[PDB]
Design a protein around this nucleic acid. Sequence first.
DNA 1: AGAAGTCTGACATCCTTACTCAGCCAGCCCCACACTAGGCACTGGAAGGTGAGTCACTCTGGTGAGGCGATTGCGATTGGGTGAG
Length: 66
Amino acid sequence: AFIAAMKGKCLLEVTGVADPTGCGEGFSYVKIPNKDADLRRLSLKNAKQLLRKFGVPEEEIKKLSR
DNA sequence: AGAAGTCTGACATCCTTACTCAGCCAGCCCCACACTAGGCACTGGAAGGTGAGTCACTCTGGTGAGGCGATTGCGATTGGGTGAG
């Protein structure tokens, strides 16, 4: 698994059971493959006011991307 | 004492009624178009509302690719049997 990952054949799940620590420290070398109706009726403006009400940050409110 | 501006007083004409019978107009009555100006109606234009179509986004379905994974095939190793010394 590790030598195949070094050639770029495949990837390795770095968290797994092959982990020699048994905790989150250390890697595991085993192969993984490399491979609304009423919401549309919010009619942008009221959805903007709803995002203001929930506490969504002003950047997302500002974008104005319906 | 001489002129002046009225002033009662003593006449002088053409109103009346009036025929009459002329020939021609002026002044009213009773309307004829006739006519002007604006009320009513019609037409046109503008505005507003509704309906339809299009655009964008999201969801669902279909197709493709992968995917891992089992199954099959091949190769290698081990064991057993037979033959030879």
